[PDB]
Amino acid sequence: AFELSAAEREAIEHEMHHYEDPRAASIEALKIVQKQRGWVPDGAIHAIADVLGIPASDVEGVATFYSQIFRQPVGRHVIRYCDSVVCHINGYQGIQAALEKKLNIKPGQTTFDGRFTLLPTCCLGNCDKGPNMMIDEDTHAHLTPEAIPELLERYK
Amino acid sequence: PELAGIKDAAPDATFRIRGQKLAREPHRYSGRTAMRANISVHEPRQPQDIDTMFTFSMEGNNQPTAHRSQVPFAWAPGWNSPQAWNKFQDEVGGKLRFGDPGVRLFETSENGLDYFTSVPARFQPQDGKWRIAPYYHLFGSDELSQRAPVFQSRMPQPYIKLNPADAAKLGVNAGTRVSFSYDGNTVTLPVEIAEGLTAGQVGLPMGMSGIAPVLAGAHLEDLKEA
Amino acid sequence: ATIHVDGKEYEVNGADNLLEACLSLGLDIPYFCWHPALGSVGACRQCAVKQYQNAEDTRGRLVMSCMTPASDGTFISIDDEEAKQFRESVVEWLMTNHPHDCPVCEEGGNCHLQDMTVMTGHSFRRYRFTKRTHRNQDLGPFISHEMNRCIACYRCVRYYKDYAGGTDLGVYGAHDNVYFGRPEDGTLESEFSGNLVEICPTGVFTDKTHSERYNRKWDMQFAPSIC
Amino acid sequence: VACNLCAVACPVGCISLQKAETKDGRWYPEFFRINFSRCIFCGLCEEACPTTAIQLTPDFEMGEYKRQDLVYEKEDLLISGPGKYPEYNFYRMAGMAIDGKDKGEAENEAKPIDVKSLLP
Amino acid sequence: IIRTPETHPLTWRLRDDKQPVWLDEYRSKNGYEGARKALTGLSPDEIVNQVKDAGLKGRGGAGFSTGLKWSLMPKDESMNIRYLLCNADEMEPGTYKDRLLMEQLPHLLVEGMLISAFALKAYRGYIFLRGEYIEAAVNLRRAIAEATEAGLLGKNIMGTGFDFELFVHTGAGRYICGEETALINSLEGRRANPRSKPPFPATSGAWGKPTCVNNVETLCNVPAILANGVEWYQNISKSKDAGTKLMGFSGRVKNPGLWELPFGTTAREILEDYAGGMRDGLKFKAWQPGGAGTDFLTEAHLDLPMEFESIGKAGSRLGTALAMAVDHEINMVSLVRNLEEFFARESCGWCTPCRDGLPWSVKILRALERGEGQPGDIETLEQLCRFLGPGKTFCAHAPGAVEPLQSAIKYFREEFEAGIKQPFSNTHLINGIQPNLLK
Ligand SMILES: Cc1cc2nc3c(=O)[nH]c(=O)nc-3n(C[C@H](O)[C@H](O)[C@H](O)COP(=O)(O)O)c2cc1C
Ligand code: SF4
Ligand code: SF4
Ligand code: SF4
Ligand code: SF4
Ligand code: SF4
Ligand code: FES
Ligand code: FES
């Protein structure tokens, strides 16, 4: 049971006249559904395929190729801590240990109440202020393991 | 004389490759002293093939360079996959070496035909009569294929296809069982709505049980809800 | 054209790629991702030959023979040690995650991957880590699916999408987690979905009708017939 | 697992069998017959077995009155124990799912990672 | 440090309050004047010749000259459908210059890409930005609105008649999207798989049309070259490479950040002058010049200028010229493990050697981390690196992936041999079968 809304369909069409190929709006349509629901369910792939005209296999391959498009359901807030080389020099291991101590989950798993989802990510473009952690609209920098409980309590 | 080309389709039973016939089975055919041992421990006759150039046995020829066109299977030493056809071809992706099997019966004629002046009239949908539109299925039209038990799950259920306007005229919706009588026999089928069909026609699956392919292009009488 | 394979002169077609020209002459080159009907993409990295710029060259250059055209006066080598080492290494990398499934696999004795593993001479394993596994989709009553045996050679997607014009078979995921199949469980809707059992070099797509009453290829009594 | 390697490895061709499959997907022989009037006791079938199912035992007293009774079917060949190899199990190594072993539960196999997983 | 426009033509109009520069302040500081000069009195082929004379090279890391890339398009005038792309992906780790550029200077990039479109007759433009740059995307969209309301984009640009429009496409988090052919494939809406050469993206790029992709730094250095002359741009750095470069250090240093330096600057001159050295009690063990895809170098290679050819025979690459220093406390085994883990989880997985050999190297490094190394692991790493060179794989992502591996092998082999503790045991004993004792 899936149905694209009028606003989502209008946004997808608005992205569609930007390019000369309706296939080129597949990533942006998936991101639109991602913003408007939090994850891409099973019927959303078929809905995007029906709206765009490309087959559902292409939309499924695009959704599963990119890491920032989620096909499994997540919590209200996602945690994307950087684990690349500069943040490894800056010591993201203490941040990961503090996150696993607080949330009592594993990287890739979600909490029982859906409060947070612990994920690693790629480079965040904030090497000079590493380590960095990406929440939905915030790029937290200069992370310390003592400040992790203070930072996690401001998101509900 | 119009079928005189079938002699060249394949060579006769005296055809040999350096004296030996063509093997039906590979070189490592197994179990020959035990495949029939439950019936009798004495091995039976190897079946003699007087009709063709093949033998029902290991003892034959299946070399990729054999001067022949009828290749029973592709096998080469080190190429056990279907990629042994590369060994059995003159060039890969081209023809079979020493020519492809089969021969065309007739050549292209020098002079052609004339224009068929009989241009048909338009289709006029008459009331009470329904034109049968053939809807062929890859699984269900050829009779021997419907006999196959693995095709009975792949084939669709027999659905009679109707226009939305015709379905509105009879007042039947999708999935409803309607009955029709042809040659004095009433048969019922569930209705599927076809938007691409035209009015005055009715779609039927040719080849299925009870719906002969001869029904295509024929009128249909007494289309009513069951 | 004119090619020099290990010093031997060969006459081939100039428009052909080097792999198909060498296969036409009876020379054995391992290959997975190339099919005569599907074209070439150069994924499997299996058809390496060492090409030389001129007649007297020592180092040469390792090149892919399914991308290299068979131009006139093309000097290549197949059986030299560097190319054989690279092809054995590629087979070994394909063999890292491959399941221990040959006795219980319908492609045993009919497998392109088995033939190319044996042809490269790779028989000693030095991989001691874990092997990736995949869940098996249901593809209907004709095609049986087993994604553990895949080598990510992209022949199925090429045939089914580009050649056969299908719409419900694709590749998903990235790196070594690529999955070839439908987005969900269901029957492969193409009328030519059965050719995947010959396009696939491995046992991912197998004949389920044959799998019910299965026997190996050497045990089969074959005849040439017309459908 | 009815893989037919012993039957093809037999130089006399005195092994006949047919693959059957259970509901969980494991392979087994529907029947297994050996023509012991033809068998030369060379041990090539035991050498070719990838599961160590077929074995040759220290038993020579197989004399018979009728030659038809030298065809040993599956009920005469399958014994109650592991024979000369007490611990080997092929299905602990095979990467095909059966009852008691899901995908990733075989030896040296990681857990299956779905393409819809959240991990990068 | 005051950056005069005479030697710093890129970072002389910056603001120190961390606030973006809008259209008014950019127009006050020599905005859209050279672009007017080019669109009025200078032919597009003459702009191409000026780029040839200036010797502008690619800032993405390849070092390819911009003029040669611009001149590779065919001479057929019937192919009017032309695309210009700005590679604002910045997916390489250790690089953070484009975020700082876009947070305070979008209009310079817009103007430079406008000239690059006019010089190449490109009618459509796209900025491919990564998906984790939210404020950069907001600032770019506001710059689009301000330029469109001022007539800078669209139809009839100051009476020239050239039609051009720019759209911003956000990324979706994949490192392989940064490659040019993969960027073209991901722009079309398919999986970001690279394309083999032949063909070339200058002939058949986006949707088969002529399409050229340039870096943000190249498109921002273009206005300085065009407006302040060509011979003046040649008279900035006296070396084989002409121009300036965004440079800086990151990772356990006193003053990490971004500055602008000309070609020929030695790597030591950023350590104690701009970065001010490291923290307390840290020894210079290693450094890596061009982000995660470049070779590591030692202290003997620190006294070596940052050019392209200078690092060419040094056994490394210039890269993005944003180096990162590894001290003595950070073990190189864990660092190389993390680098290969990133390069394996963010690989595209098209071709066999990288796809099925980077996990093998990752597992070998995981074993070497825990002391579970076995004899036959380092040699496996060398064999994989030798069989992962330029052209041994489908593209150049994997040579850049195993450049750090071979560099840490060459310079720090003693740290990798310490992980080998147990003998090679691949098999387990099977009761009833005597093993073949290989010698
Ligand atoms: C694997 C790979 C990743 C790349 N990632 C980026 C990137 O994230 N951002 C970028 O500006 N260039 C990146 N590049 C470089 C360009 O995509 C391209 O290779 C070329 O060097 C661009 O030339 P330019 O500097 O003139 O724009 C990458 C190159 C490769 C091979
Ligand atoms: S696909 Fe080939 S190599 Fe893989 S298990 Fe089957 S027969 Fe063996
Ligand atoms: S499923 Fe088969 S054809 Fe498809 S990529 Fe894998 S090995 Fe190749
Ligand atoms: S021991 Fe007997 S059954 Fe086994 S291979 Fe030899 S002859 Fe055949
Ligand atoms: S006895 Fe062994 S070799 Fe013979 S079919 Fe069974 S598993 Fe295969
Ligand atoms: S080297 Fe790796 S990233 Fe590049 S094409 Fe091959 S699989 Fe993809
Ligand atoms: S390495 Fe973490 S922000 Fe760049
Ligand atoms: S056959 Fe050439 S790389 Fe696959």
Side-chain angles (χ1 to χ4, degrees), chain A residues 18 31 65 67 121 123-124, chain E residues 99 130 170 173-174 345:
Chain A
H18 285 133
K31 289 185 70 171
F65 181 75
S67 54
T121 165
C123 182
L124 303 183
Chain E
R99 174 204 283 265
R130 76 192 312 175
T170 62
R174 190 57 64 174
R345 77 170 170 83

Side-chain angles (χ1 to χ4, degrees), chain B residues 24-26 28-30 54 56 73-74 78-83 86-87 90-92 138-139 151 153-154, chain C residues 20 24 26 28 31 34 36 109-112 115 119 141-142 155 187-188 191 209 217-222 224:
Chain B
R24 273 182 173 92
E25 60 210 35
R28 306 290 291 158
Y29 190 85
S30 80
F54 280 82
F56 294 100
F73 61 97
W79 300 77
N80 321 308
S81 45
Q83 322 287 128
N86 299 150
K87 290 293 189 179
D90 42 11
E91 63 165 357
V92 292
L138 200 77
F139 324 100
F151 269 26
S153 66
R154 188 65 175 86
Chain C
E20 100 161 283
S24 304
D28 285 332
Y31 70 102
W34 177 80
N110 208 1
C111 183
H112 188 56
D115 295 340
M119 168 159 312
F142 299 150
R155 284 224 290 219
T187 319
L188 282 171
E191 289 83 9
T209 71
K217 190 190 171 179
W218 54 77
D219 276 332
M220 216 99 65
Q221 190 166 357
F222 288 109

Side-chain angles (χ1 to χ4, degrees), chain E residues 5 21 54 110 223 233:
Chain E
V21 174
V110 167
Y233 177 76

Side-chain angles (χ1 to χ4, degrees), chain D residues 25 39 44 61 72 79 94 100:
Chain D
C39 166
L44 257 50
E61 306 178 357
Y72 276 45
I79 68 171

Side-chain angles (χ1 to χ4, degrees), chain A residues 82-87 122-127 132, chain E residues 93-94:
Chain A
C82 187
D83 68 329
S84 309
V85 70
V86 156
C87 297
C122 49
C123 182
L124 303 183
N126 235 29
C127 326
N132 321 279

Side-chain angles (χ1 to χ4, degrees), chain A residues 18 20-21 23-24 26-28 31 61-62 65-68 83-84 88-89 121 123-125 128 134, chain E residues 83 96 99 124 126 130 132-133 167 170-174 186-191 207 252 335 338 345:
Chain A
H18 285 133
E20 74 163 10
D21 201 5
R23 192 192 297 272
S26 54
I27 312 176
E28 205 65 37
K31 289 185 70 171
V62 166
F65 181 75
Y66 297 112
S67 54
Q68 303 332 341
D83 68 329
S84 309
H88 166 52
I89 294 188
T121 165
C123 182
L124 303 183
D128 43 347
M134 207 56 135
Chain E
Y83 297 90
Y96 55 93
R99 174 204 283 265
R124 188 57 65 86
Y126 292 106
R130 76 192 312 175
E132 47 262 27
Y133 279 176
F167 306 110
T170 62
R174 190 57 64 174
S186 60
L187 187 72
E188 297 172 1
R190 290 183 287 182
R191 292 160 54 90
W207 306 285
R252 285 186 174 177
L335 207 85
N338 195 21
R345 77 170 170 83

Side-chain angles (χ1 to χ4, degrees), chain A residues 79 81 92-108 118 120 148 152:
Chain A
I79 295 176
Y81 67 84
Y92 76 83
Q93 282 84 12
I95 308 301
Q96 174 171 339
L99 284 160
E100 290 177 13
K101 186 175 61 59
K102 176 65 65 179
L103 294 179
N104 208 15
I105 60 179
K106 300 300 180 180
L118 188 59
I148 304 303
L152 288 187

